[PDB]
Design a protein around this ligand. Structure first.
Ligand code: HEM
Ligand SMILES: COc1cc(NS(=O)(=O)C(F)(F)F)cc(OC)c1Oc1ccc(C#N)c(Cl)c1
Length: 455
């Protein structure tokens, strides 16, 4: 009825995502590009190298857009959102969210507008450190978080408003938790599965505080944020019950936006700065290139990216080098399917090695090293690449690819606009090797001085 690919024989101290993705490459060398790990009798077919991931996610896009069940499910039921939702709930909501996240029925003010307001609120806050050493984690995590508030509620929040420090205390708890290394099973369990639940319930509850307030004032002819907009779709598509667009889904879709939208971004910001210290000649050119195009008066902006081949390459390379999410999130096929020489039954969990594709040794020669010129033709022009998948590929591609890209580019340039960066350690020995993690490439702890600018 269905025949998986060959893999090692089933079943197989502190082990992390960077390590799992290594093991997966080792097994590529033995078994070929497509193979199968068992886990008792849970088959997880893994997918490695560009040709397989292209073939599967892109050329068989629909058949591979399912969501793997993960390590677990959760009876607080998070699969009425985007990340963990499926079939037709997913099709309709993703589409909606997509379009909302690109200025359709969300007031006049744009998403670029918003990352720009924060971009400034963020440089302000980085001047409070007075040039004195500083761990960017808190500040850098606050920005992307506040953007999601703003897209969703329409008010960002001073970096002191308790309502905020609570929201972000809860997100950081789910971080320490989920970025838990493995050992055969993930590490955690001991009294944390219920602090996970408690916290999700807090979050839903709070989005619901704000949803009530939004329903107080609703109005076809004036949406201004996700919640408004969503409620409007719940109107246009009534008498067409039962619906995918309900309150139950609004709530888990927003929770989803904060979850996906924050630590992935802030982690990359954290890693973008770290790499800036360790590579003072690159920061130099970037900062220069920022002089030549944007100066010190105005705010940076998405139109300047295209006049900035070196800066756009640096981000790309920050995003490719760090390998934020070695294996994406897990996939699952939507139905039975013949893929190359194999029938994979409906349901089967698919795992994608983004490491394998971002870290290809032919397309990115010397791929272990960090080098802007990986995204530069021999003439120093900007080189786009079919192999660029920080955000995955195909129909489940990060629904915030464009926004992630906005916050990275606007925030980083802003930071580079107003400040030189001074590492405590001498760049020369500064270790950058990432700390062991449950599902992401996270950087070591570091400090830096944000010195107001001088040439
Ligand atoms: C550097 C920033 C980010 C990176 C590297 C990133 C990366 C990814 C990756 C690798 C996936 C998995 C796609 C798959 O399952 O095959 C993903 C999914 C997702 N990302 Fe992002 N993401 C980033 C920022 C954001 C932001 C800012 C948002 C907010 C809109 C966001 C929202 C989502 C959502 C909702 C999903 C799941 C969508 C779906 O399952 O259909 N991400 N992201
Ligand atoms: C995109 O993956 C994330 C999913 C969640 N979901 S959730 O925490 O609301 C739960 F458990 F209910 F599913 C949350 C995330 O954190 C805010 C996600 O993104 C993460 C998680 C951990 C790390 C690390 N380290 C990073 Cl970089 C991103």
């Amino acid at each position: 009825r269905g025949k998986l690919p060959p893999g090692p024989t089933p079943l197989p101290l502190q082990i992390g995502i960077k390590d799992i993705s290594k093991s997966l490459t080792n097994l590529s060398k033995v078994y070929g590009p497509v193979f199968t790990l068992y886990f008792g009798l849970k088959p997880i077919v893994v997918l490695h190298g560009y040709e397989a991931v292209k073939e599967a996610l892109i050329d068989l896009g629909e058949e591979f857009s399912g969501r793997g069940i993960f390590p677990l499910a959760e009876r607080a039921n998070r699969g009425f959102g985007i990340v963990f939702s499926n079939g037709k709930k997913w099709k309709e909501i993703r589409r909606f969210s997509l379009m909302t996240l690109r200025n359709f029925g969300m007031g006049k003010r744009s998403i670029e507008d918003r990352v720009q307001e924060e971009a400034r609120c963020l440089v302000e806050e980085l001047r409070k450190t007075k040039a004195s050493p500083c761990d960017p984690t808190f500040i850098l995590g606050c920005a992307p978080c506040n953007v999601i508030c703003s897209i969703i509620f329409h008010k960002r929040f001073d970096y002191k408003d308790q309502q905020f420090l609570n929201l972000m205390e809860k997100l950081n708890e789910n971080i320490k938790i989920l970025s838990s290394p493995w050992i055969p099973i993930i590490d955690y369990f001991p009294g944390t599965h219920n602090k996970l639940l408690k916290n999700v319930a807090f979050m839903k509850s709070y989005i619901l505080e704000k949803v009530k307030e939004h329903q107080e004032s609703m109005d076809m002819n004036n949406p201004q944020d996700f919640i408004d907009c969503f409620l409007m779709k719940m109107e246009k598509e009534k008498h067409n019950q039962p619906s995918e667009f309900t309150i139950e889904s609004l709530e888990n879709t927003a929770v989803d936006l904060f979850g996906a939208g924050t630590e992935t971004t802030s982690t990359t910001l954290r890693y973008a700065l770290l790499l800036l210290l360790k590579h003072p000649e690159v920061t130099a050119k970037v900062q220069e290139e920022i002089e030549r195009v944007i100066g010190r008066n105005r705010s940076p902006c998405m139109q300047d990216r295209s006049h900035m081949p070196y800066t756009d390459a640096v981000v790309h390379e920050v995003q490719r080098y760090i390998d934020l999410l070695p294996t994406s999130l897990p996939h699952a096929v939507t139905c039975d399917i013949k893929f190359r020489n194999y029938l994979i039954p409906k349901g089967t969990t698919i795992l994608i090695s983004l490491t394998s594709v971002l870290h290809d040794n032919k397309e990115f020669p010397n791929p272990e090293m960090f080098d802007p010129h990986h995204f530069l033709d021999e003439g120093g022009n900007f080189k786009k690449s079919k192999y660029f998948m920080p955000f995955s590929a195909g129909k489940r591609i990060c629904v915030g690819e464009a926004l992630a890209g906005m916050e990275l580019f606007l925030f980083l340039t802003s930071i580079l606009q107003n400040f030189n960066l001074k590492s405590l350690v001498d760049p020369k020995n500064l270790d950058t090797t990432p700390v062991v993690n449950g599902f992401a490439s996270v950087p070591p702890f570091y400090q830096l001085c944000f010195i107001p600018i001088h040439h």
